[PDB]
Amino acid sequence: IVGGYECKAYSQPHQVSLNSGYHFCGGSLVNENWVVSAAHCYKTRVEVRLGEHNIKVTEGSEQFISSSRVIRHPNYSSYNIDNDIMLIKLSKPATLNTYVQPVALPSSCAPAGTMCTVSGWGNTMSSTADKNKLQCLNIPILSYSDCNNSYPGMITNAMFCAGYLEGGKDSCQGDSGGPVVCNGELQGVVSWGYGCAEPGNPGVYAKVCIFNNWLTSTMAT
Ligand SMILES: [Ca+2]
């Protein structure tokens, strides 16, 4: 997260860290047995770390749970990152508490201008922001017109832009797969963008609100 502020510890209880030796992507707990992330973060197996604030030190609220299933969206394509969404089933249910809580799926699609929160342990491009601690940032959803204008022909119906065309505030590598929450619902998944926080290059996110059926259907399994 570039240009944000440190999240208060456990203020984003749905935020999870996908770990394979080291943190490599974010994710969002949507129920005790399932986590939503980006398809490009895929691995046959991954360790889900919940209840994290500082990912380098044990703080007592962590729960490390190995995956039992990793399911990429059937229409995910690596050539353009279309349908960059994925579900991770936990081998054992997460124990919900004050530090670990699921985030609701969208009950509607958030329109342009809606303010959201994006968080993660990715690149901060800062010499003062402790990258080991969960970073927070508020970003508004941009219109499709702004999105396509920024990335001509690269935006599908499964993507939306959020952030500021002026630059300075954006998510970044390492935040990938992480949450974009607006009005208490998971509207997006950190996916891609040109560089980070660059003017005219806003962040692009998987549009969770058009995947409700696939998500619900898949979680029945
Ligand atoms: Ca920790």
PDB file of C-alpha atoms and ligand atoms in Angstrom:
ATOM      1  CA  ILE A   1       0.000   0.000   0.000  1.00  0.00           C
ATOM      2  CA  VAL A   2       1.456   3.319  -1.148  1.00  0.00           C
ATOM      3  CA  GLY A   3       0.464   6.613   0.443  1.00  0.00           C
ATOM      4  CA  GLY A   4      -1.728   5.143   3.152  1.00  0.00           C
ATOM      5  CA  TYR A   5      -1.570   4.943   6.942  1.00  0.00           C
ATOM      6  CA  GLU A   6      -1.037   2.024   9.298  1.00  0.00           C
ATOM      7  CA  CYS A   7      -4.290   0.172   9.931  1.00  0.00           C
ATOM      8  CA  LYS A   8      -5.235  -0.035  13.584  1.00  0.00           C
ATOM      9  CA  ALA A   9      -4.413  -3.590  14.694  1.00  0.00           C
ATOM     10  CA  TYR A  10      -7.208  -6.023  13.786  1.00  0.00           C
ATOM     11  CA  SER A  11      -9.394  -3.284  12.318  1.00  0.00           C
ATOM     12  CA  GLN A  12      -9.613  -5.359   9.103  1.00  0.00           C
ATOM     13  CA  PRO A  13     -10.400  -8.771  10.709  1.00  0.00           C
ATOM     14  CA  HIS A  14     -11.144 -10.370   7.322  1.00  0.00           C
ATOM     15  CA  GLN A  15      -7.659  -9.573   6.011  1.00  0.00           C
ATOM     16  CA  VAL A  16      -5.459 -12.615   5.603  1.00  0.00           C
ATOM     17  CA  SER A  17      -1.896 -13.192   4.485  1.00  0.00           C
ATOM     18  CA  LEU A  18      -1.189 -16.000   2.035  1.00  0.00           C
ATOM     19  CA  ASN A  19       2.150 -17.489   3.018  1.00  0.00           C
ATOM     20  CA  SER A  20       4.533 -19.731   1.072  1.00  0.00           C
ATOM     21  CA  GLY A  21       7.812 -19.343   2.913  1.00  0.00           C
ATOM     22  CA  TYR A  22       6.955 -15.651   3.063  1.00  0.00           C
ATOM     23  CA  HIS A  23       3.885 -13.471   2.644  1.00  0.00           C
ATOM     24  CA  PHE A  24       3.156 -13.267  -1.100  1.00  0.00           C
ATOM     25  CA  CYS A  25      -0.482 -12.192  -1.460  1.00  0.00           C
ATOM     26  CA  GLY A  26      -3.450 -10.984   0.527  1.00  0.00           C
ATOM     27  CA  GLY A  27      -6.902 -12.508   0.813  1.00  0.00           C
ATOM     28  CA  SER A  28     -10.276 -12.001   2.493  1.00  0.00           C
ATOM     29  CA  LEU A  29     -12.078 -14.378   4.855  1.00  0.00           C
ATOM     30  CA  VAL A  30     -15.729 -14.647   3.738  1.00  0.00           C
ATOM     31  CA  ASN A  31     -16.751 -17.437   6.142  1.00  0.00           C
ATOM     32  CA  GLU A  32     -15.043 -19.802   8.592  1.00  0.00           C
ATOM     33  CA  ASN A  33     -13.987 -22.152   5.780  1.00  0.00           C
ATOM     34  CA  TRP A  34     -13.337 -19.889   2.785  1.00  0.00           C
ATOM     35  CA  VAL A  35     -10.981 -17.132   1.658  1.00  0.00           C
ATOM     36  CA  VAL A  36     -11.268 -15.014  -1.500  1.00  0.00           C
ATOM     37  CA  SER A  37      -8.076 -13.947  -3.292  1.00  0.00           C
ATOM     38  CA  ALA A  38      -6.752 -13.253  -6.801  1.00  0.00           C
ATOM     39  CA  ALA A  39      -6.380 -16.084  -9.287  1.00  0.00           C
ATOM     40  CA  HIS A  40      -2.867 -14.967 -10.240  1.00  0.00           C
ATOM     41  CA  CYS A  41      -1.835 -15.687  -6.630  1.00  0.00           C
ATOM     42  CA  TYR A  42      -2.674 -19.357  -7.226  1.00  0.00           C
ATOM     43  CA  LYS A  43      -0.646 -22.228  -5.745  1.00  0.00           C
ATOM     44  CA  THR A  44      -1.699 -25.875  -5.373  1.00  0.00           C
ATOM     45  CA  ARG A  45      -1.436 -25.365  -1.618  1.00  0.00           C
ATOM     46  CA  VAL A  46      -0.998 -22.300   0.576  1.00  0.00           C
ATOM     47  CA  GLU A  47      -0.909 -21.437   4.261  1.00  0.00           C
ATOM     48  CA  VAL A  48      -3.549 -18.912   5.268  1.00  0.00           C
ATOM     49  CA  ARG A  49      -2.535 -16.607   8.111  1.00  0.00           C
ATOM     50  CA  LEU A  50      -5.418 -14.904   9.885  1.00  0.00           C
ATOM     51  CA  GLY A  51      -5.354 -12.497  12.827  1.00  0.00           C
ATOM     52  CA  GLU A  52      -2.203 -10.769  11.623  1.00  0.00           C
ATOM     53  CA  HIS A  53      -1.036  -7.201  12.088  1.00  0.00           C
ATOM     54  CA  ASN A  54       2.766  -7.421  12.093  1.00  0.00           C
ATOM     55  CA  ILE A  55       3.529 -10.396   9.832  1.00  0.00           C
ATOM     56  CA  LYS A  56       7.104 -10.728  11.091  1.00  0.00           C
ATOM     57  CA  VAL A  57       6.289 -11.110  14.797  1.00  0.00           C
ATOM     58  CA  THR A  58       3.889 -13.335  16.741  1.00  0.00           C
ATOM     59  CA  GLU A  59       1.306 -11.149  18.475  1.00  0.00           C
ATOM     60  CA  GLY A  60      -0.966 -13.883  19.790  1.00  0.00           C
ATOM     61  CA  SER A  61      -4.004 -13.363  17.565  1.00  0.00           C
ATOM     62  CA  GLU A  62      -2.702 -15.391  14.625  1.00  0.00           C
ATOM     63  CA  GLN A  63      -4.211 -18.582  13.266  1.00  0.00           C
ATOM     64  CA  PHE A  64      -2.206 -20.417  10.603  1.00  0.00           C
ATOM     65  CA  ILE A  65      -4.332 -22.803   8.546  1.00  0.00           C
ATOM     66  CA  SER A  66      -3.289 -24.873   5.536  1.00  0.00           C
ATOM     67  CA  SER A  67      -5.512 -24.881   2.458  1.00  0.00           C
ATOM     68  CA  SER A  68      -7.514 -27.972   1.504  1.00  0.00           C
ATOM     69  CA  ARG A  69      -8.580 -26.575  -1.867  1.00  0.00           C
ATOM     70  CA  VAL A  70      -7.539 -23.722  -4.164  1.00  0.00           C
ATOM     71  CA  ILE A  71     -10.030 -22.953  -6.925  1.00  0.00           C
ATOM     72  CA  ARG A  72      -9.324 -20.370  -9.627  1.00  0.00           C
ATOM     73  CA  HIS A  73     -12.307 -18.930 -11.475  1.00  0.00           C
ATOM     74  CA  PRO A  74     -12.977 -21.209 -14.473  1.00  0.00           C
ATOM     75  CA  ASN A  75     -12.618 -18.307 -16.902  1.00  0.00           C
ATOM     76  CA  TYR A  76      -9.453 -16.804 -15.418  1.00  0.00           C
ATOM     77  CA  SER A  77      -6.913 -15.936 -18.105  1.00  0.00           C
ATOM     78  CA  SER A  78      -3.291 -15.108 -17.379  1.00  0.00           C
ATOM     79  CA  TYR A  79      -2.836 -13.287 -20.670  1.00  0.00           C
ATOM     80  CA  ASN A  80      -4.978 -10.345 -19.517  1.00  0.00           C
ATOM     81  CA  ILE A  81      -5.851 -11.152 -15.882  1.00  0.00           C
ATOM     82  CA  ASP A  82      -9.549 -11.388 -16.754  1.00  0.00           C
ATOM     83  CA  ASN A  83     -11.628 -12.953 -13.946  1.00  0.00           C
ATOM     84  CA  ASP A  84      -8.747 -12.622 -11.499  1.00  0.00           C
ATOM     85  CA  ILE A  85     -10.586 -14.162  -8.553  1.00  0.00           C
ATOM     86  CA  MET A  86     -10.066 -17.386  -6.619  1.00  0.00           C
ATOM     87  CA  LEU A  87     -11.398 -19.328  -3.629  1.00  0.00           C
ATOM     88  CA  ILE A  88      -9.297 -21.053  -0.980  1.00  0.00           C
ATOM     89  CA  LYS A  89     -10.892 -23.642   1.282  1.00  0.00           C
ATOM     90  CA  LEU A  90      -9.399 -24.006   4.759  1.00  0.00           C
ATOM     91  CA  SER A  91      -8.471 -27.540   5.871  1.00  0.00           C
ATOM     92  CA  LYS A  92      -9.966 -26.682   9.262  1.00  0.00           C
ATOM     93  CA  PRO A  93     -12.463 -23.917  10.085  1.00  0.00           C
ATOM     94  CA  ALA A  94     -11.049 -20.628  11.337  1.00  0.00           C
ATOM     95  CA  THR A  95     -12.057 -19.810  14.904  1.00  0.00           C
ATOM     96  CA  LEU A  96     -13.946 -16.537  14.666  1.00  0.00           C
ATOM     97  CA  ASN A  97     -13.233 -13.973  17.364  1.00  0.00           C
ATOM     98  CA  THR A  98     -12.402 -10.291  17.830  1.00  0.00           C
ATOM     99  CA  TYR A  99      -9.332 -10.583  15.561  1.00  0.00           C
ATOM    100  CA  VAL A 100     -10.764 -12.900  12.912  1.00  0.00           C
ATOM    101  CA  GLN A 101     -14.090 -12.145  11.236  1.00  0.00           C
ATOM    102  CA  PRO A 102     -15.458 -12.711   7.724  1.00  0.00           C
ATOM    103  CA  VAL A 103     -16.423  -9.844   5.429  1.00  0.00           C
ATOM    104  CA  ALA A 104     -19.783  -9.890   3.653  1.00  0.00           C
ATOM    105  CA  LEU A 105     -20.059 -10.384  -0.095  1.00  0.00           C
ATOM    106  CA  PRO A 106     -21.611  -7.523  -2.093  1.00  0.00           C
ATOM    107  CA  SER A 107     -25.396  -7.186  -1.958  1.00  0.00           C
ATOM    108  CA  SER A 108     -25.121  -4.868  -4.972  1.00  0.00           C
ATOM    109  CA  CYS A 109     -22.406  -3.364  -7.170  1.00  0.00           C
ATOM    110  CA  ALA A 110     -20.815  -0.229  -5.735  1.00  0.00           C
ATOM    111  CA  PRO A 111     -21.152   2.710  -8.155  1.00  0.00           C
ATOM    112  CA  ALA A 112     -18.401   5.114  -9.164  1.00  0.00           C
ATOM    113  CA  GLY A 113     -17.544   7.506  -6.357  1.00  0.00           C
ATOM    114  CA  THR A 114     -18.107   4.945  -3.600  1.00  0.00           C
ATOM    115  CA  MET A 115     -15.353   5.182  -0.983  1.00  0.00           C
ATOM    116  CA  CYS A 116     -13.578   1.943  -0.125  1.00  0.00           C
ATOM    117  CA  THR A 117     -10.760   0.607   2.015  1.00  0.00           C
ATOM    118  CA  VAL A 118      -7.873  -1.357   0.524  1.00  0.00           C
ATOM    119  CA  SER A 119      -5.282  -2.948   2.809  1.00  0.00           C
ATOM    120  CA  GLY A 120      -2.224  -5.152   2.663  1.00  0.00           C
ATOM    121  CA  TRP A 121       1.415  -5.916   3.383  1.00  0.00           C
ATOM    122  CA  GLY A 122       2.689  -5.060  -0.090  1.00  0.00           C
ATOM    123  CA  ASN A 123       5.196  -2.487  -1.339  1.00  0.00           C
ATOM    124  CA  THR A 124       4.824   0.879   0.420  1.00  0.00           C
ATOM    125  CA  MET A 125       7.490   2.771  -1.541  1.00  0.00           C
ATOM    126  CA  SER A 126       8.169   4.534   1.771  1.00  0.00           C
ATOM    127  CA  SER A 127      11.217   4.659   4.041  1.00  0.00           C
ATOM    128  CA  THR A 128       9.059   5.405   7.082  1.00  0.00           C
ATOM    129  CA  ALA A 129       6.009   3.146   6.694  1.00  0.00           C
ATOM    130  CA  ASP A 130       6.697  -0.133   8.519  1.00  0.00           C
ATOM    131  CA  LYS A 131       5.906  -2.583   5.718  1.00  0.00           C
ATOM    132  CA  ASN A 132       5.615  -5.426   8.241  1.00  0.00           C
ATOM    133  CA  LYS A 133       2.455  -3.860   9.672  1.00  0.00           C
ATOM    134  CA  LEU A 134      -0.880  -3.936   7.848  1.00  0.00           C
ATOM    135  CA  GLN A 135      -1.352  -0.746   5.818  1.00  0.00           C
ATOM    136  CA  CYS A 136      -4.692   0.927   5.082  1.00  0.00           C
ATOM    137  CA  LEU A 137      -5.856   3.283   2.342  1.00  0.00           C
ATOM    138  CA  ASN A 138      -9.138   4.837   1.284  1.00  0.00           C
ATOM    139  CA  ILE A 139      -9.812   4.784  -2.446  1.00  0.00           C
ATOM    140  CA  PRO A 140     -12.907   5.761  -4.451  1.00  0.00           C
ATOM    141  CA  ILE A 141     -14.222   3.658  -7.322  1.00  0.00           C
ATOM    142  CA  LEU A 142     -13.672   5.275 -10.729  1.00  0.00           C
ATOM    143  CA  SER A 143     -16.101   5.258 -13.648  1.00  0.00           C
ATOM    144  CA  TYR A 144     -15.634   2.728 -16.424  1.00  0.00           C
ATOM    145  CA  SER A 145     -14.879   5.668 -18.722  1.00  0.00           C
ATOM    146  CA  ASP A 146     -11.952   6.730 -16.530  1.00  0.00           C
ATOM    147  CA  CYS A 147     -10.764   3.132 -16.264  1.00  0.00           C
ATOM    148  CA  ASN A 148     -10.814   2.429 -19.996  1.00  0.00           C
ATOM    149  CA  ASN A 149      -9.253   5.825 -20.709  1.00  0.00           C
ATOM    150  CA  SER A 150      -6.342   4.899 -18.436  1.00  0.00           C
ATOM    151  CA  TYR A 151      -5.975   1.385 -19.862  1.00  0.00           C
ATOM    152  CA  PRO A 152      -7.566   1.356 -23.370  1.00  0.00           C
ATOM    153  CA  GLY A 153      -9.066  -2.020 -24.261  1.00  0.00           C
ATOM    154  CA  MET A 154      -7.629  -3.732 -21.178  1.00  0.00           C
ATOM    155  CA  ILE A 155     -10.694  -3.485 -18.930  1.00  0.00           C
ATOM    156  CA  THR A 156     -13.263  -6.312 -18.978  1.00  0.00           C
ATOM    157  CA  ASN A 157     -16.583  -6.454 -17.128  1.00  0.00           C
ATOM    158  CA  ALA A 158     -14.754  -8.381 -14.393  1.00  0.00           C
ATOM    159  CA  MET A 159     -12.521  -5.399 -13.586  1.00  0.00           C
ATOM    160  CA  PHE A 160     -12.943  -1.942 -12.098  1.00  0.00           C
ATOM    161  CA  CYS A 161     -10.533   0.863 -11.306  1.00  0.00           C
ATOM    162  CA  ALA A 162     -10.217   2.541  -7.926  1.00  0.00           C
ATOM    163  CA  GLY A 163      -7.861   5.162  -6.565  1.00  0.00           C
ATOM    164  CA  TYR A 164      -6.735   8.529  -7.901  1.00  0.00           C
ATOM    165  CA  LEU A 165      -5.707   9.454 -11.431  1.00  0.00           C
ATOM    166  CA  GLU A 166      -3.528  12.111  -9.770  1.00  0.00           C
ATOM    167  CA  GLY A 167      -1.422   9.316  -8.294  1.00  0.00           C
ATOM    168  CA  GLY A 168       0.253   9.092  -4.895  1.00  0.00           C
ATOM    169  CA  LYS A 169      -2.185   6.637  -3.283  1.00  0.00           C
ATOM    170  CA  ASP A 170      -2.621   3.070  -4.544  1.00  0.00           C
ATOM    171  CA  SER A 171      -2.218  -0.620  -3.716  1.00  0.00           C
ATOM    172  CA  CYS A 172       0.860  -2.455  -5.017  1.00  0.00           C
ATOM    173  CA  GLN A 173       2.529  -5.838  -5.484  1.00  0.00           C
ATOM    174  CA  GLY A 174       2.248  -7.821  -2.286  1.00  0.00           C
ATOM    175  CA  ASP A 175      -1.240  -6.401  -1.736  1.00  0.00           C
ATOM    176  CA  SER A 176      -2.421  -8.545  -4.649  1.00  0.00           C
ATOM    177  CA  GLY A 177      -5.366 -10.774  -3.795  1.00  0.00           C
ATOM    178  CA  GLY A 178      -6.279  -8.463  -0.928  1.00  0.00           C
ATOM    179  CA  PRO A 179      -9.590  -6.768  -0.015  1.00  0.00           C
ATOM    180  CA  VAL A 180     -11.334  -3.637  -1.216  1.00  0.00           C
ATOM    181  CA  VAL A 181     -14.223  -3.117   1.200  1.00  0.00           C
ATOM    182  CA  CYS A 182     -16.980  -0.544   0.727  1.00  0.00           C
ATOM    183  CA  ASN A 183     -20.068  -0.200   2.935  1.00  0.00           C
ATOM    184  CA  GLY A 184     -19.024  -3.308   4.839  1.00  0.00           C
ATOM    185  CA  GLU A 185     -18.883  -5.545   1.763  1.00  0.00           C
ATOM    186  CA  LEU A 186     -16.069  -7.036  -0.326  1.00  0.00           C
ATOM    187  CA  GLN A 187     -16.368  -5.198  -3.641  1.00  0.00           C
ATOM    188  CA  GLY A 188     -12.899  -5.876  -4.978  1.00  0.00           C
ATOM    189  CA  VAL A 189      -9.757  -7.978  -5.019  1.00  0.00           C
ATOM    190  CA  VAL A 190      -6.368  -6.302  -5.597  1.00  0.00           C
ATOM    191  CA  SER A 191      -5.382  -7.358  -9.126  1.00  0.00           C
ATOM    192  CA  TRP A 192      -3.089  -5.138 -11.213  1.00  0.00           C
ATOM    193  CA  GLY A 193      -1.988  -1.737 -12.449  1.00  0.00           C
ATOM    194  CA  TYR A 194       0.901  -0.006 -14.216  1.00  0.00           C
ATOM    195  CA  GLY A 195       3.497   0.567 -11.535  1.00  0.00           C
ATOM    196  CA  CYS A 196       2.051   1.842  -8.267  1.00  0.00           C
ATOM    197  CA  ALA A 197       0.537   5.219  -7.407  1.00  0.00           C
ATOM    198  CA  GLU A 198       1.580   6.571 -10.802  1.00  0.00           C
ATOM    199  CA  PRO A 199      -0.465   9.421 -12.293  1.00  0.00           C
ATOM    200  CA  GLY A 200      -2.975   8.181 -14.863  1.00  0.00           C
ATOM    201  CA  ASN A 201      -2.385   4.551 -13.830  1.00  0.00           C
ATOM    202  CA  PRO A 202      -5.033   3.700 -11.204  1.00  0.00           C
ATOM    203  CA  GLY A 203      -5.375   0.361  -9.476  1.00  0.00           C
ATOM    204  CA  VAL A 204      -7.440  -2.334 -11.172  1.00  0.00           C
ATOM    205  CA  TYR A 205      -9.486  -4.760  -9.082  1.00  0.00           C
ATOM    206  CA  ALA A 206     -11.543  -7.906  -9.642  1.00  0.00           C
ATOM    207  CA  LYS A 207     -15.234  -6.904  -9.583  1.00  0.00           C
ATOM    208  CA  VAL A 208     -16.504  -9.235  -6.855  1.00  0.00           C
ATOM    209  CA  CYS A 209     -20.149  -8.155  -7.218  1.00  0.00           C
ATOM    210  CA  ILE A 210     -20.515 -10.057 -10.512  1.00  0.00           C
ATOM    211  CA  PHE A 211     -19.233 -13.328  -9.025  1.00  0.00           C
ATOM    212  CA  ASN A 212     -21.827 -13.889  -6.294  1.00  0.00           C
ATOM    213  CA  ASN A 213     -23.273 -16.991  -7.956  1.00  0.00           C
ATOM    214  CA  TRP A 214     -19.912 -18.618  -8.662  1.00  0.00           C
ATOM    215  CA  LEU A 215     -18.659 -17.797  -5.169  1.00  0.00           C
ATOM    216  CA  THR A 216     -21.778 -19.113  -3.422  1.00  0.00           C
ATOM    217  CA  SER A 217     -21.924 -22.195  -5.640  1.00  0.00           C
ATOM    218  CA  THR A 218     -18.250 -23.001  -5.136  1.00  0.00           C
ATOM    219  CA  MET A 219     -18.448 -22.569  -1.354  1.00  0.00           C
ATOM    220  CA  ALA A 220     -21.194 -25.195  -1.232  1.00  0.00           C
ATOM    221  CA  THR A 221     -18.444 -27.614  -2.115  1.00  0.00           C
TER     222      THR A 221
HETATM  223 CA    CA B   1       2.080 -11.545  13.533  1.00  0.00          CA
END
